[PDB]
JSON list of C-alpha atoms in Angstrom, two decimals:
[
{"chain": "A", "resi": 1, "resn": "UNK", "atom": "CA", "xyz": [0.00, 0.00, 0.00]},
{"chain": "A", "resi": 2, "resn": "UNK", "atom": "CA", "xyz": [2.06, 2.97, -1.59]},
{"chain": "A", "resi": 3, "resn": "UNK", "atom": "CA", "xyz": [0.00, 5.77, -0.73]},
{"chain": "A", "resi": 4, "resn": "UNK", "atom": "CA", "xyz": [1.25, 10.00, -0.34]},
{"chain": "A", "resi": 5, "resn": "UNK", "atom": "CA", "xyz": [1.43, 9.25, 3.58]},
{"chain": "A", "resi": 6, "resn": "UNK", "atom": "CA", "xyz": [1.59, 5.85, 5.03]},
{"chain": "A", "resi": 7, "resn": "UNK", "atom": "CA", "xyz": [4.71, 5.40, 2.42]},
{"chain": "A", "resi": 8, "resn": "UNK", "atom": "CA", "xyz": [6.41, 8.92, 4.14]},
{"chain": "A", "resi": 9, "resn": "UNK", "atom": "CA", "xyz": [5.92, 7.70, 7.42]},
{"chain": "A", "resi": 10, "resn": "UNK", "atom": "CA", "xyz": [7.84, 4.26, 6.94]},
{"chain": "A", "resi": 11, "resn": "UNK", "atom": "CA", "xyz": [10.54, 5.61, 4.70]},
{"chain": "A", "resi": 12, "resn": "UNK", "atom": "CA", "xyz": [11.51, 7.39, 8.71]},
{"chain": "A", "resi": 13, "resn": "UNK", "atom": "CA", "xyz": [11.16, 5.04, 10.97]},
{"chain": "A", "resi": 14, "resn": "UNK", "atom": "CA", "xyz": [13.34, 3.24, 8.42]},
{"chain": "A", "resi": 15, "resn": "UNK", "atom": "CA", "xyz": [15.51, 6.07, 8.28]},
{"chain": "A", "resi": 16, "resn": "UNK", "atom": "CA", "xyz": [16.04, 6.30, 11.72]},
{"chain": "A", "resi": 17, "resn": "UNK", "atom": "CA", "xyz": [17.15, 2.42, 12.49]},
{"chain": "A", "resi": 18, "resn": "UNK", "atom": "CA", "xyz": [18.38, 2.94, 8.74]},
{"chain": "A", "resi": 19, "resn": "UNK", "atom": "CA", "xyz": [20.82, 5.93, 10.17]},
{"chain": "A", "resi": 20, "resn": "UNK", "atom": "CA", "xyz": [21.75, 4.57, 13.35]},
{"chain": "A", "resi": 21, "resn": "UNK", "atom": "CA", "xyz": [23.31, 0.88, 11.66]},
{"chain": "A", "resi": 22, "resn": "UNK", "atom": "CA", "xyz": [25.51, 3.16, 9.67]},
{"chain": "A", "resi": 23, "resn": "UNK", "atom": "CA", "xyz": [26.92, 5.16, 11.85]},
{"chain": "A", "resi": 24, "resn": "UNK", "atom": "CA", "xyz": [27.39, 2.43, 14.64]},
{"chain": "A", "resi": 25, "resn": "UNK", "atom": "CA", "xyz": [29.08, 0.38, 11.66]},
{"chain": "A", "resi": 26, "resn": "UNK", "atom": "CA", "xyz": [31.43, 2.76, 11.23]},
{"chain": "A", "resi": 27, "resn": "UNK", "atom": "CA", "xyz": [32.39, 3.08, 14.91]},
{"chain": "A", "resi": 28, "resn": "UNK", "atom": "CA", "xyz": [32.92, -0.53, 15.04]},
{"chain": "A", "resi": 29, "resn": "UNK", "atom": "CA", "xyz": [30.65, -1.44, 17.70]},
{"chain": "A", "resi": 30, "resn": "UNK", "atom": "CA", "xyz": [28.17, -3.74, 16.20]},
{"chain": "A", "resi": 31, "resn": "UNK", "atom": "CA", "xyz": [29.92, -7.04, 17.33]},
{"chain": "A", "resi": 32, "resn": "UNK", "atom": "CA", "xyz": [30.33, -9.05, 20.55]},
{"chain": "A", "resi": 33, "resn": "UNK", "atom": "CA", "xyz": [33.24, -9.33, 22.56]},
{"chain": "A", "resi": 34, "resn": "UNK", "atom": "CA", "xyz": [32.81, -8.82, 26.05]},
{"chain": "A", "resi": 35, "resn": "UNK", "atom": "CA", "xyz": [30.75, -5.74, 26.93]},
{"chain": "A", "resi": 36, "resn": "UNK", "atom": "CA", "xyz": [29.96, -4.31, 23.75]},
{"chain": "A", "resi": 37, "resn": "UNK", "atom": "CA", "xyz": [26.92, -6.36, 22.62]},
{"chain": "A", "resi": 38, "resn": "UNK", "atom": "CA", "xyz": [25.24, -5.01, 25.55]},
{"chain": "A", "resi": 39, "resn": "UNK", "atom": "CA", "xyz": [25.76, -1.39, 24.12]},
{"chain": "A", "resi": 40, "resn": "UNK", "atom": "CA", "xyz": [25.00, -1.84, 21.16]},
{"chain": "A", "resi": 41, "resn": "UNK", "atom": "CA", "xyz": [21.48, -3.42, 21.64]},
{"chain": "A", "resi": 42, "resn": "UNK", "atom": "CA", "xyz": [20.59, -1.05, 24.67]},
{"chain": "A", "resi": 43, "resn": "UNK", "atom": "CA", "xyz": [21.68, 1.46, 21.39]},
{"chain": "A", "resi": 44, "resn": "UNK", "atom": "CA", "xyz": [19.37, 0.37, 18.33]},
{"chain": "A", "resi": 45, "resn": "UNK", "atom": "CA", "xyz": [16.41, -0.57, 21.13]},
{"chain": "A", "resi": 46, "resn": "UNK", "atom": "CA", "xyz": [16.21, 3.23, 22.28]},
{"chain": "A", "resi": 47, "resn": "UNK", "atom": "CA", "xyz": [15.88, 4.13, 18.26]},
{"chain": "A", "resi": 48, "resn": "UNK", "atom": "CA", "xyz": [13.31, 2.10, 17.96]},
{"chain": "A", "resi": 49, "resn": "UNK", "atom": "CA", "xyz": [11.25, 3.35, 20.44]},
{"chain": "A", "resi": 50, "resn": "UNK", "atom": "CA", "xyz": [11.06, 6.76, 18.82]},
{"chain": "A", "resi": 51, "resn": "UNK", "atom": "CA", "xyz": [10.24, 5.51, 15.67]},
{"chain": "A", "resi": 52, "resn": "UNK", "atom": "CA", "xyz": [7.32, 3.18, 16.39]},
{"chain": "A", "resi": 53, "resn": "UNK", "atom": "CA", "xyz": [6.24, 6.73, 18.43]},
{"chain": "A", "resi": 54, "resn": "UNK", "atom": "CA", "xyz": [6.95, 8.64, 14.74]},
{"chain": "A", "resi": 55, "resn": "UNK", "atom": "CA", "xyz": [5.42, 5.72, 12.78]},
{"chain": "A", "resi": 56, "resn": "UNK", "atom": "CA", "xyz": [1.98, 4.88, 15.24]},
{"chain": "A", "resi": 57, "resn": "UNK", "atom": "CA", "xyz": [0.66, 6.01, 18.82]},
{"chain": "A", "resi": 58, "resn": "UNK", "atom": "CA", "xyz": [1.36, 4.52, 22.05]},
{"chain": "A", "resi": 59, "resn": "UNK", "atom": "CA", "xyz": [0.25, 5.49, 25.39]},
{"chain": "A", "resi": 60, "resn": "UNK", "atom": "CA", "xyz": [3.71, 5.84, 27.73]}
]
């Protein structure tokens, strides 16, 4: 469904996780190791939240 606003608001939330991946990738700290998995999640998760926020509601 490719409409003039449901299509706008995915390409962001996309954008945002889209974004984030990149720039992490660059910094090299997308892997395990010993405590870097446990950034890295806590990282992405946090993005995520806004976007479901940008994309639909939510009550909290």
């Amino acid at each position: 469904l490719k409409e003039n606003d449901h299509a706008r608001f995915l390409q962001t939330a996309k954008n945002i996780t889209e974004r984030v991946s990149m720039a992490t990738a660059s910094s090299q700290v997308l892997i395990p190791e010993i405590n870097l998995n446990d950034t890295f999640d806590t990282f992405a998760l946090d993005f995520s939240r806004e976007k479901k926020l940008l994309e639909c509601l939510d009550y909290l």
